[PDB]
Amino acid sequence: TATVREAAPQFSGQAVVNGAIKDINMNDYKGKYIVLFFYPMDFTFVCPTEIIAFSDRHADFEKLNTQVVAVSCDSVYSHLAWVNTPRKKGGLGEMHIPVLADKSMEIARDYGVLIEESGIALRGLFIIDKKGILRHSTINDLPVGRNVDEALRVLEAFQYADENG
Amino acid sequence: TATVREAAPQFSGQAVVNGAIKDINMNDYKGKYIVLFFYPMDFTFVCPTEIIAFSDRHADFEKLNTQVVAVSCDSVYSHLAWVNTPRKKGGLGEMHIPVLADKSMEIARDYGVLIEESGIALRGLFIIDKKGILRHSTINDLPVGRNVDEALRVLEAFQYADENG
Amino acid sequence: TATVREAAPQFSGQAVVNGAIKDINMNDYKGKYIVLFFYPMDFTFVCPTEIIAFSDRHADFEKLNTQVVAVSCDSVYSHLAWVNTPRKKGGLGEMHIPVLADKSMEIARDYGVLIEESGIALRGLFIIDKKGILRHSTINDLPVGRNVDEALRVLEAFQYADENG
Amino acid sequence: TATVREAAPQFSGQAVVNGAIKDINMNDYKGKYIVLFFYPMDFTFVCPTEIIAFSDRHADFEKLNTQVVAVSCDSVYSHLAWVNTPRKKGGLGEMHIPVLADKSMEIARDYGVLIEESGIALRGLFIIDKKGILRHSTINDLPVGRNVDEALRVLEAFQYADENG
Amino acid sequence: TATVREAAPQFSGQAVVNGAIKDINMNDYKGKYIVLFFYPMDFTFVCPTEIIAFSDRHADFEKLNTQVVAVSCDSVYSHLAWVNTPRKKGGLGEMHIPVLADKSMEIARDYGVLIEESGIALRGLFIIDKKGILRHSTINDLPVGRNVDEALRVLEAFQYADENG
Amino acid sequence: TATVREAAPQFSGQAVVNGAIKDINMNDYKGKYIVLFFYPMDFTFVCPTEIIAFSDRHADFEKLNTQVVAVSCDSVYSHLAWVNTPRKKGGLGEMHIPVLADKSMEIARDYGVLIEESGIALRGLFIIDKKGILRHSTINDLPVGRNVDEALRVLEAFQYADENG
Amino acid sequence: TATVREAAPQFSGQAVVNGAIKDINMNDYKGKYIVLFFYPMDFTFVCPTEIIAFSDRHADFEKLNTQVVAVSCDSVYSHLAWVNTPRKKGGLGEMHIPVLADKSMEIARDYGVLIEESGIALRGLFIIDKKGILRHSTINDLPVGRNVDEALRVLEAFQYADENG
Amino acid sequence: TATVREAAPQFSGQAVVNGAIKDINMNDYKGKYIVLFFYPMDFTFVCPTEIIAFSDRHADFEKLNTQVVAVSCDSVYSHLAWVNTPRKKGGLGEMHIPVLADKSMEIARDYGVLIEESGIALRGLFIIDKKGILRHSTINDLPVGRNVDEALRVLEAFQYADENG
Amino acid sequence: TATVREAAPQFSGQAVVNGAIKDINMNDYKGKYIVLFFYPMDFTFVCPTEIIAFSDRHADFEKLNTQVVAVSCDSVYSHLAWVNTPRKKGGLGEMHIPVLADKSMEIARDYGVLIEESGIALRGLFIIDKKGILRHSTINDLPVGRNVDEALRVLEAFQYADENG
Amino acid sequence: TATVREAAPQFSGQAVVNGAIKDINMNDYKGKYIVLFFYPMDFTFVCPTEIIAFSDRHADFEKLNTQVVAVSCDSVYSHLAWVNTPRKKGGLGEMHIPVLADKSMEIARDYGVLIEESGIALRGLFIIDKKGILRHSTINDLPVGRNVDEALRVLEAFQYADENG
C-alpha cells in the first residue's frame, strides 16, 4: 500500500477548493510537503471538529510549504454540499483546503486507510516529502480525531530534518 | 454479475426510510417483487427528476406488490442529507422509498451497474421476482433517466405473466 | 459480455430485409444509433406483437437516425419463412426491419441475452450509440414483451443528451 | 464427441411427432436401434428430399426394430412450422419420424456434426445399438444427402451381426 | 482427429500396388478425390469380401477421378503376403488398389478409426475432396462391411455437387 | 502486516525490565492498551530523547491502563547494555518500560515498521486495544521522533471512546 | 519402461501355440523364467533364421524351466498365417513357441523395444526371473539377430546363480 | 537414457590405459565401433573373469575396428589400484582396455545400467556404431557375466550388416 | 543438507571395521558423539596422513564417548582393499575406525560435502551430538587435511559445554 | 548458501576498524585470503575470548596475506559501543580487525550461519581464497568458540597448497 520510507502513491481526483470542483492531481503540489488527511465520511452526526480545525489553521500549513489535502471516500457533490452547508447546521462552512473526493476509493486503498467492508477511510494523516516519498503515517481508527499541533510539529520537524539532518 | 434468468444477488445495507437509517436487507421484502433502482450519485446539479418521480408514484408500486429500493453508491449520511434537503434547493424533500446506501459498492457491483473507474452506479432498474430471481434489467448510461410508467408496465406484465403465463 | 458504458460487441450475419437474405454487418449502420432487438424464437404460438409493433413503427426509428435490428437465434430460412407467412396465420407479413439470424448464437451470447440451456435469446433491447458504444440495455425474461414508445423515449433522450448533455 | 465403438451420447429435447411437441428423451427408445439423422436446417431452398425419403420409408425402420430421429439445430416451433407447411410449398407435409429440436446444439455437438461457426449440423446418420453404444457414423458435408437403402442395409447388417456375429 | 468439414490429415506409408511395395504419400494423388478405406486386419477368418469388392470395381473409381486407398494397421509384408495369397485360400489374389500399411497406426489414429486397445482400424471409408479436405466419413464397427455402390453414389454426388452445387 | 481496524499481531521476546531480561509475551499485558513503541537502533549518536521521554512519563501510561513496550531490532544484550549505560554518556540510565528485543525482526516485520534493507525499525507507535485489535498507527521515518503528549492524547481518547463512543 | 533390476512389465495377448490362437497371459508361465523374444515383423524378405532357431531348440528351454515367448507387433492372424506358411516359401512351418501378437504395441512399448516411428519391435531378448523381475536385456537393432546358445548360456547362468549365488 | 536405435550418450572420464590415467573422451574413438562394457565394482570377492576375458581377447576387438571401454562407477585410483594388483591376489594384472572411471555415475546413468540405490552399474555391454548411434544393448543383472564370443559375434554381425545390409 | 543447529542426517552403509564389512547404521552409535569424517577418495597418490592420524589416535575418541566414522564415496571393496594394503605401499594398514562406504553418495550429499561433478566428498568433519543433532561442521576443500587435536579440542569442548553450559 | 568448492558470497557493510565506522566491502580485500569470523552477538555475559584472541593475534594474519573480518548480526553502533567498552568491564577494548555489522543478516544468511529463529549467527569461520572462492568452513554451534592456531594452521596450509599443490 503506502509504506513510509518508500514513495507515496499518487492521488488524483475532483476536489472542492473555495466552493467549486477543481479536478486536482498530486502533481499540482510538486515542491511541497503534502499532508494527506483522510476523514471517514461526510454529513456525520458528530461535529466535523478536525477538518474545521485544519481549515482554520491553514496559514500554519502555508507557512511550512505544505498542502493539506482532506480526503474522503465520498463523491465531490457531497463534499460541495457540506462545504456549502452552514457550520451551525453541522456543516463545514468556510473550508480552506482541497476536499478531495475519493469516490472510487482508489486513494484510500493506496494509502491503506480504506475500510473495505464499509467503504470509508480510516482517520489518517500522511506527510509526503516534496521528493514525493512518504515520511509520516498517522492512522487512527474511526473514533479518535487528528490534532493540528501534532501535524504541525511532525511536519516542521520533517522540514528541519530535511534541511539539516 | 446479475443475469436475468438466474437468481438476483442479495442486497443489504443502511437505507433511508421516512427520514432515518434502517439497515435494510433484501429479505425484508420477501414475497414482493423488487424494483432495484440505481441512481448515480447524490446532490447532483441536475434536478433529481426520476427518484422524485418514483417516490411520488410509490402507491402504484404498493398496489402491484413490489418495493422500489433506490440505490446509490453514496453513504447513508449523504442520503439522509439530501432527503432532508428541501426540494426547492435541488433536494429530494419527501422521499417515500428506501434510499439504500451502497457505500462499499457491493450492490452496484453485483448488479453490473457499477462504473468502477468513477465509483458510481449506472442508471439501472432491476425487477426481481418474488421467487428472488431477476426478471428485468433496464440499464441506462448516466444521461438518460428511467421512467415510471415503463417500470409499472413491465412490473405489472411480470405480475400478469407470473399469475397466468 | 455487453456492458453499457463500454463498446457494444459487433454483430454480423444473414438478415431478412424486404423479403430476402442480405448478409448484414453492424458496420452497414455506422453513423446511426442501433436498436438491437432480440426476440426469442420464430413461429411461436403467441402472436408476434412486439416485432410487428416495431416494424409498423419503423418510420419513428428512421426519423431518430437509428436502425432497429430484430435478432433471433433462428436461422435465416426460418426468418424468411415467417416473414413470408401471412399475418392472419400467426406470421409476420410485412416486415420492415432487418430480421437478423443469429444461428450460431454469437450475437446473443455477446449481448448477454442468450439462454444457453435452451439456445434462444432473452427479450432484449439494446441502444448502441453511433460512436459504437452501448448506452441502454433493456432485457426482459421471456414472457414480457418490449414496448415501442419506451424505446422511442429512451432513444430520443439519448439523442437529445448526445446533442446537448 | 461420439466415437463409434464407445457409448453414444444421450439426446433429449422437444421433438415433433404427428404434428405436436413431445419432449422426447433417448430413453424412450430403449431396446431399439437408433438412427439419429441430422439434417442441417429448416425451410431450405432445396427440397427436403432425404427427410421425406426417410419419413415415407418409416415402415422399413419399424420392421428392423429401430427409430429414425431426425435432428436439426432449429427450434421446435420451426420444426412444427415446416412439418405443417404443405409439401408442394417446399415443406414436409406428412412427417412420420421424431423431428428433434437441438436448439441449444448440444446433441449436434455431442455427435460431432455441429458446424460451430454457422450453428447448423452436418448431414449425419448415426446407428446406435440397442445396448446404447454407437456402431455406425455416416457424416456428410452439407451438399450430399443421405440415402435410405444405405441406412437400411447397414442397419439390418448390424441386426444380423448382433444376432449371429 | 479427422473432422469432415476441415482438412483431411495426411497419410503416407508403404503400400502394395500390383504386387510390390511403393512407399506412397497422399500427395501422389493430388487432384483426385481420395477414398481412404480402412479394413481392420489381414488374414482374417472371414472372407475379404469388401476389399475384393472394391478392387474388382476399381474402374468405377478410375472413372470418377478418385483413388481408393485401402488401409490396415498391418505391416506391408503381411499386405504383400495376402495379396499374394490365392483367393481360394481365403486371400485376396488380384488386388488393384493401394493396400496401405499403417503399421505405426498413425493414419488410423488421425482418421479416428484406430481401436487403440486392439491396435486395429474400424471399418472406415473417408472421401477426401481434391482440395484435400474431408467431405464424407463412413465409419462402421468391425462386423458390418462397406458397400461399393454406396461409396460410388456418395463419391459421384460429391463430384456433381463440387461441379455445380 | 498490521492493519489498524484488524487484530494486532502478537509480539513475544526477551525484554529488559528494571535491569534484567524477562522474556515477555504480549499476553502478559492482557486487559491493557498496548503502546508498542519502535525506536530504530541502540547506542545511536543522537541522544535517546523519545525513549527517555516515555520512560520518565511512565506514570501517565500506568494511569491510562496501558503499557509502553519500547521495541528495537537489537538484541537484548545491547538493550541491557545501554540501559546500564549512564545517561550522561549518551545512554538511557533509568529505563521504566519493557525494552523489547526484536532480534529476529519478527515483531517489526509484523508491524510494518521493519526497514528490511537495513534491518532496523521505523520510528513507530502502535496503540493496541485491550481487545487485542490495533487502533492507532503512528509511523515516522527515521529522523522525526515521537512525542509523549501526542500518544497520551490519542491513548486517552481511545479510552474515552471505548468507554462511551 | 523395463528396467533390469526392477519388475518386468506384464504381457498379455493372443499368441499362436501349435497352430491356433490361445490368448496367453504372462501369469500362465508363473514359476518359470521367461525369455521374451521380440522379432520385428512377419513375412519379411529375409529368412526367419532366429525364430526357427529358437523353435527348433525349444527342448533346451523346456529343460531350463523357461518359456520362450516370441513377440511381434503384428496381429495374431498374420502370426497364424506365417506359422501356417511352409518353410520353403519363406515361412515358419513348425513353430513350437508362443508367437505372441502385440498388435496394440503395448508389450513392445513396456519392454522398450518398440520403434514408435515404424510400429515394429527391436530385436530384443529379455530374461524374466520366475519371481517376475527382469534380469537380462539383450536388445539388438533390426539387422543383427539373436543367437540361441547365447540365450541358453545367460539363461542357465541365471539359473545356477539363483540356485547358489 | 540410451535407446538402441537412437544416438548413444557421450562418455568422458579418467580411464586407466597401460597403467596410468588418461582422461579419455568418447571422441577419442571416432570411426570405431565402441563396446562399452560396464562391470559393477572393483576389488570384488569374485574373480574378475569377464574383464580379464575381454582384456586377453583385445586383439579380436582390434581386428573388428572397435574399442572395448570397460566402465565401472568406481574412481580411477581404485581402477589403477586393482589393475596394479597382481592377478593371483584376486586382481586384474595385465589390463589391455580403457578401465573408465564413472565416479560421478553419469555414464552409467546415461546408459541405464546405474543401480541408483547402490551406486554401481549393471553388468552391461553396449555396441555403439561408428556413426555414434547405439546398436546393441546387453544388460545383465549383477550375477551373470558377459561372454566375449557373444560380443564378438554381435559386433562382427553389426560390421557385416553395416557393410552390406 | 546438514545444518549445524538442526538434526544431523542419518547415515547407514557397509563400513570396514577390523578388516571386514559390517553394514553399520548411525543408530549403532546412539548415546555417543559422532565424528563423521569425510575423506575424498581411496588409493590416492598422496599418503593418507589424516585418516591414519585418526585411526592411531582412536583411544582419544574412545575416551571422549565418541566414534569417528571415516566416510568416502568409494565402495566397500575398495575400502577393504586399501585397509588391507600395507602402509609402506601407500595404504592404510591398521585401521581402527569404521571406514564407511558411501557408494551411492547419499551420506556425502546429505552432509553437503559431496562434490557432485566429480562424485567425491569434500574433506569434512562433522560432530553430531548424542541427541542426534549436528553441532560442528569443519569442511575443507580437497587440499587441506583435517587435524586430530583440532577435532579433540572441539569435541571435548562440546562435551564440557553439554555437561555444564 | 556458501558451498566450499564454489564461490564465496559477497559481504558488504558498515564495519568498525580502529574505533570508527568504515562501510567495508569484500572487494576492499581483493588479493587476500579472507577469514570471515562470525561471532553470535554483542555484549554477551561470557567474556569475548575468541574475538580478543583473534584481534591480539592479528599480526599472524597480516603475515599470511589474509584479513580476519569478525561479523555479527548486530548493528554497527553496538559494535562501536563494545569495542569502546573497556576490557575489564566485559568489553573488547583494543580491537584490531573489522567488526562487521550484519544488521540485515544478509551476510550470515549467505554464509549459512544465521540462526533464523533468533536472528544471530552461528560461531563460524570461513576461509575464502583470494580468487574469491570459499575453501574452508568451520561452523560451531553457539557454545564452543573458535581457536586461532586452528585457523592459522588451516589458513597457511591453504597458502602452501595454493602455492605448490
Coordinates of C-alpha atoms in Angstrom, one line a residue, chain A:
Chain A
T1 CA 0.0 0.0 0.0
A2 CA 1.7 3.2 1.3
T3 CA 5.0 2.3 3.0
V4 CA 6.6 5.2 4.8
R5 CA 10.2 5.0 3.6
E6 CA 9.0 4.3 0.0
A7 CA 7.3 6.5 -2.5
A8 CA 3.9 7.8 -1.7
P9 CA 1.1 6.6 -4.1
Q10 CA -0.3 9.2 -6.4
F11 CA -3.7 10.8 -5.7
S12 CA -5.9 12.5 -8.3
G13 CA -9.5 13.4 -8.3
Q14 CA -12.2 16.1 -8.1
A15 CA -11.6 18.2 -5.0
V16 CA -13.5 21.1 -3.6
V17 CA -11.4 24.3 -3.3
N18 CA -13.2 27.6 -2.4
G19 CA -16.6 26.3 -3.2
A20 CA -16.2 24.5 -6.6
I21 CA -14.8 21.4 -8.2
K22 CA -11.2 21.6 -9.4
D23 CA -10.1 18.1 -10.5
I24 CA -6.8 18.1 -8.6
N25 CA -3.8 15.9 -9.2
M26 CA -1.0 15.3 -6.7
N27 CA 1.4 16.9 -9.2
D28 CA -0.3 20.2 -8.7
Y29 CA 1.6 20.4 -5.3
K30 CA 5.0 19.4 -6.5
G31 CA 7.7 21.1 -4.4
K32 CA 5.5 21.0 -1.3
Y33 CA 5.1 18.6 1.5
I34 CA 1.7 17.0 1.3
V35 CA -0.5 16.4 4.4
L36 CA -3.0 13.9 3.1
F37 CA -5.8 14.0 5.6
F38 CA -8.4 11.2 5.4
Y39 CA -11.6 11.8 7.3
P40 CA -14.2 8.9 7.2
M41 CA -17.4 10.3 5.6
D42 CA -19.5 13.4 5.0
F43 CA -22.5 14.8 6.9
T44 CA -21.8 12.8 10.1
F45 CA -23.8 13.3 13.2
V46 CA -20.6 14.3 15.1
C47 CA -19.4 17.8 14.5
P48 CA -16.6 18.0 12.0
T49 CA -14.0 19.2 14.5
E50 CA -10.7 18.1 13.0
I51 CA -11.3 19.3 9.4
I52 CA -12.6 22.7 10.6
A53 CA -9.5 22.7 12.9
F54 CA -7.3 22.1 9.8
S55 CA -9.1 24.6 7.6
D56 CA -8.9 27.4 10.2
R57 CA -5.2 26.6 10.7
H58 CA -4.4 26.6 7.0
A59 CA -2.0 29.5 7.3
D60 CA 0.2 27.4 9.6
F61 CA 0.5 24.9 6.7
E62 CA 1.0 27.6 4.0
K63 CA 4.0 28.8 6.1
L64 CA 5.6 25.4 6.3
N65 CA 5.5 24.9 2.5
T66 CA 2.9 22.1 2.6
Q67 CA -0.7 21.5 1.5
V68 CA -3.4 19.7 3.5
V69 CA -5.5 17.6 1.1
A70 CA -8.5 16.4 3.1
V71 CA -9.7 13.2 1.5
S72 CA -12.9 11.3 2.0
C73 CA -14.4 8.3 0.0
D74 CA -17.5 10.4 -0.7
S75 CA -18.4 12.0 -4.0
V76 CA -17.5 15.6 -4.8
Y77 CA -21.1 16.6 -4.9
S78 CA -21.5 15.6 -1.2
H79 CA -18.2 17.5 -0.5
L80 CA -19.5 20.6 -2.2
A81 CA -22.8 20.0 -0.4
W82 CA -21.5 20.1 3.1
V83 CA -18.9 22.7 2.5
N84 CA -21.9 24.8 1.4
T85 CA -23.8 23.6 4.5
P86 CA -23.6 26.4 7.2
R87 CA -21.5 25.5 10.1
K88 CA -24.3 25.9 12.7
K89 CA -26.2 23.2 10.9
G90 CA -23.5 20.6 11.5
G91 CA -21.7 21.6 8.3
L92 CA -18.3 22.9 7.4
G93 CA -19.0 26.5 6.3
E94 CA -15.7 28.1 5.3
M95 CA -13.4 25.4 4.0
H96 CA -9.8 26.4 3.0
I97 CA -8.2 23.1 1.9
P98 CA -8.8 20.7 -1.0
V99 CA -11.7 18.5 0.0
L100 CA -10.7 15.6 -2.3
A101 CA -13.3 13.1 -3.4
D102 CA -12.1 9.5 -3.5
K103 CA -15.4 8.1 -4.7
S104 CA -13.7 5.2 -6.4
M105 CA -11.8 4.6 -3.1
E106 CA -8.5 4.3 -5.0
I107 CA -6.7 6.9 -2.9
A108 CA -7.9 5.4 0.4
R109 CA -6.9 1.9 -0.8
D110 CA -3.4 3.0 -1.9
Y111 CA -2.9 4.7 1.5
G112 CA -4.1 1.7 3.4
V113 CA -6.8 3.6 5.3
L114 CA -9.8 2.2 3.3
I115 CA -12.2 0.2 5.4
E116 CA -13.1 -2.1 2.6
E117 CA -16.2 -3.6 4.3
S118 CA -17.8 -0.2 4.9
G119 CA -16.3 1.8 2.0
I120 CA -15.0 4.6 4.2
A121 CA -11.5 5.8 5.1
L122 CA -9.7 5.5 8.4
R123 CA -8.9 8.7 10.1
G124 CA -5.5 9.1 8.5
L125 CA -2.8 11.7 8.2
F126 CA 0.1 11.2 5.8
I127 CA 3.1 13.5 5.4
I128 CA 4.6 13.2 1.9
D129 CA 8.0 14.6 1.4
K130 CA 8.4 17.1 -1.5
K131 CA 10.6 14.4 -3.2
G132 CA 7.3 12.5 -3.4
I133 CA 8.1 9.9 -0.8
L134 CA 6.0 9.3 2.3
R135 CA 7.6 10.2 5.6
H136 CA 4.9 10.0 8.2
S137 CA 1.8 7.9 8.7
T138 CA -0.7 8.7 11.5
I139 CA -3.6 6.3 11.1
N140 CA -6.4 6.4 13.7
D141 CA -9.4 4.2 14.0
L142 CA -12.7 6.0 13.4
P143 CA -13.3 7.5 16.9
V144 CA -10.2 9.5 17.6
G145 CA -9.7 12.5 15.5
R146 CA -6.4 14.0 14.5
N147 CA -4.8 17.1 16.1
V148 CA -3.4 20.1 14.2
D149 CA -0.5 20.9 16.6
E150 CA 0.7 17.3 16.3
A151 CA 0.7 17.5 12.5
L152 CA 2.5 20.9 12.6
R153 CA 5.1 19.6 15.0
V154 CA 5.8 16.5 12.9
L155 CA 5.6 18.5 9.7
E156 CA 8.1 21.1 10.7
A157 CA 10.4 18.6 12.2
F158 CA 10.5 16.9 8.9
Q159 CA 11.2 20.3 7.5
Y160 CA 14.1 21.0 9.8
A161 CA 15.5 17.5 9.3
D162 CA 15.3 17.7 5.6
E163 CA 17.1 21.0 5.8
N164 CA 19.9 19.9 8.2
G165 CA 19.6 16.3 9.3

